[PDB]
Structure formats: C-alpha cells, structure tokens
Design a protein around this ligand. Sequence first.
Ligand SMILES: [Zn+2]
Ligand SMILES: [Zn+2]
Lengths: 192, 192
Amino acid sequence: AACNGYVGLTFDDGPSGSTQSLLNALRQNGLRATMFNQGQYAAQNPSLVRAQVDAGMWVANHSYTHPHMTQLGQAQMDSEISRTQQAIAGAGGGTPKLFRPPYGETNATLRSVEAKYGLTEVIWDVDSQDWNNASTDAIVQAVSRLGNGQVILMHDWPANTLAAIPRIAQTLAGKGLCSGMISPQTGRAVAP
Amino acid sequence: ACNGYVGLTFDDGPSGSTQSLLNALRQNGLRATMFNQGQYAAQNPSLVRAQVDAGMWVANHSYTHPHMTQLGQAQMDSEISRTQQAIAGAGGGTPKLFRPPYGETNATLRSVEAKYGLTEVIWDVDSQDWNNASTDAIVQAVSRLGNGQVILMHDWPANTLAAIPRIAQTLAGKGLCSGMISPQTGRAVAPD
Ligand SMILES: [Zn+2]
Ligand SMILES: [Zn+2]
C-alpha cells in the first residue's frame, strides 16, 4: 500500500514567525502533523493557529507558558491547561484532545488535571533533538527510526527542522509509512 | 546486548496456566508484565507471588473485567481500588500500570486512574491469542514490534505458551530484549 503504517510527526512551541514556512514545507511535501502550541502564542497569533488547521495539521495543548508543570500546585496546572484550551479554541484551532507536558515531565496530579479537561497525555518515542542543535542529517535519521504507531518530537522553530522536511517525506515514503494523526484513545499514530 | 526493548504483556491471570507460562518465560530468558484481575489475585495470592519470583511485573486489569466506561465513577473507583489492594495484599507490589478491559476508556476512567497513580496502558499490537490465533500468528505479531512497543497477550491460551521459545528467538534475532513498561511514557524500556 501507499501507506503500510503511520507515524506521528509533531512540532512543539508554536506558533511563531517560523510557522508559516514550516506549514508550507509540510503541505508541499504531502505531510500532516500535530502542532503542540503554547497557549500564550496561540493567544498572540490567532491567524497562525488557523493557518495550521488550513494546512491540514491538528492542534494540541502544550501549556500556556511552558513551566516545569510538576513544580506547580494543582490549581496552577489547571490554569495553565485550561487557558491553553481556551486560547486554541478561541483562535479557531478546535478544542484539543491531546496534551504534551513541557519537558515530558509528568506526575499523578498533572494526570488528574489532564483528565478533567479530557486531554490524553502525549510524550514521544523518538526525540529528534532539533532543539539541541541536531543537524538536518541527525533529524532525518531520527525520523528513520520510527515504526508504525510511533511519535517523534520536533519543534516549530529550528532552521534544520524546516530544511529536513523534504528528506523526512522521502524517508517515510521509502518505508511505506505515512504521516498520521495521534489517537486520543491510545496516544499512538493512526490513519487520519 | 540489547538494541531496544519490547513490552511483553499477559492479561487476565493468574490462573491454572500461569505457572507453566512463567516457567516458559524464565527458561527462554524473558520478562513480562502480568495485568491481573483483582478477583484472581485475591483467589490465588501464591500465584501473584510466583509472577514476582519469576521476574515479572504485576499490573492492574480491574477487579471483575467489566466494560469500565459503562460504569459510574464510584463503581470504576471500586474496581480499580480493590485490585490495587488485592495485588499488594498478595505480595505483587502496588501497581503503577492499568490496562482497561477491552481497551475501552474515557475521561472519567482517566480521572480514576490518576487518583490511584496509575498509567493507562493499551497496546501497539494485539496478538489475537484470545481470538484463536495460531502459534504462527502470535509469533508473527511479536515480529511486528519495534523498540518501545507493547503487545497484548493473555495468560490462558495454549498457543501463547507454545509460542514462547519462538517469541524469544524472534526478539533475540533482532537484538530486542523484553523490557519493563515505563509509568511515565507507557513505552517499553530497560528494566530498572
Ligand atoms: Zn516544549
Ligand atoms: Zn482482559
């Protein structure tokens, strides 16, 4: 098949002055992805939140200000998550069903807050390290490790991530894998 | 010796078939997570311990295996709490992992999981061993697993027991080892 399996491409920390270029690259290369936006940036850039939707992306919750959430009390975690639901929905991004904790850091209290808002926690299977100066080569290599169902962490801002997009599409196509959405039931990548 | 880890799991024990399964796993150098029902843990405390003494991890699979999403919250709470108590009381530790019966979940269930400090664990591959899968098919399902991925098997099927040596060979051939399931990510990782 054209798609023998699906992977979860994801981009944290937008939207941003880098977002439109990234979205254009993804669509031109036939890729869809989940954008884990910060609420403060969704609030500041509602038109870019919509641009993600119009590009064929799914929009998800990445907290309001990107704190270390497990260092917060429950009320503060609740504020961070709820304000982000509101900012994304208000901007036309839908009401997210997925949440990625900043730094991947979680605890039972955070889990309770996620459940309150009907959010599935989404970590990752592979960290592209694009936030930690990974080369374009290294990012493409990280994508090459993904199997059916697996999710990769990338970010909205790195230049090497934007440069990687065509080779990411090539890597997936070579393997008979396609870009998929992330199931709120299982947290793994599935057919859109 | 391990290029990566997979999550072997067995639902619905313990049972008159458990000790045979444990012996096969240990003889073939495998470890796994046993998702026990609370009622069977209560009925067979010595077999709960046998799982620990064989090198397995023990997790929560509800008390009576209801369709949890058809229950009220207090009923879900009783099913999960009594299973925590039954497993810990039998010497299986206090579980960190919970698999919903039938893989069926909702936000209410997620809230209850969080209250008890439980990470929800579905699966990446269903072996279909509960649905009359042949030994060949079960081995084939294991062959689809990549690093981090989790497979659903059950404690009782004869073909699952028969499959253990070839499961071990399949994994060893790929440099994959049997791992623990992370409470933070729900992915298979190196045993602690
Ligand atoms: Zn982030
Ligand atoms: Zn079951």
